[PDB]
């Protein structure tokens, strides 16, 4: 199976603490889609700052998490990151936050490749908790 544990993820992404937000990859089909997992714990640093007392996962971090999953999928489909190369977040379209994500939640992210031109790549992402959609967005990422 095309699963990826945290060691392979560290080999693929440069992101580190406290901004690496992909804990596991459950499945992927190269150039088509990728399914990953973010575990939401109360022991994460942003929870001491965003509404202290009312722990809720920030939506912008859901978007960053999906963007990192798209990074994984792209590095697996097109090739790993060369030294003189960056992976940029270029844009967001029609992003909706439908249900709040709380500690204890296991957030399933599924990103699907849509279109590519030049260095830009458009993805569609959906995040689920207990089978319910908590978020969905369309993203554009650029390479180097």
């Amino acid at each position: 199976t095309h699963t990826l544990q945290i060691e392979e993820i560290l080999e693929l992404l440069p992101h580190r603490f406290p901004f690496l937000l992909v804990d596991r990859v459950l499945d992927f089909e190269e150039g088509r889609f990728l399914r990953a997992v973010k575990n939401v714990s109360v022991n994460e640093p942003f929870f001491q700052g965003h509404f202290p007392g009312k722990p809720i996962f920030p939506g912008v971090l859901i978007l960053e998490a999906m963007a990192q999953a798209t990074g994984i999928l792209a590095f697996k489909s097109v090739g790993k990151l060369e030294p003189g190369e960056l992976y940029y977040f270029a844009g967001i379209d029609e992003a909706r936050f439908k249900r709040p994500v709380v500690p204890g939640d296991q957030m399933i992210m599924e990103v699907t490749f849509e279109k590519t031109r030049r260095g830009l790549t458009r993805f569609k992402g959906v995040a689920l908790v207990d089978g319910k959609v908590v978020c969905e967005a369309t993203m554009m990422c650029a390479r180097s």
Binding site: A90, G91, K115, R117, R118, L120, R122, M140, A142
Partner: peptide
Amino acid sequence: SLDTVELVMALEE
């Protein structure tokens, strides 16, 4: 630099 690319994708669509 990003409007040119988005618009080309839009033409394609």
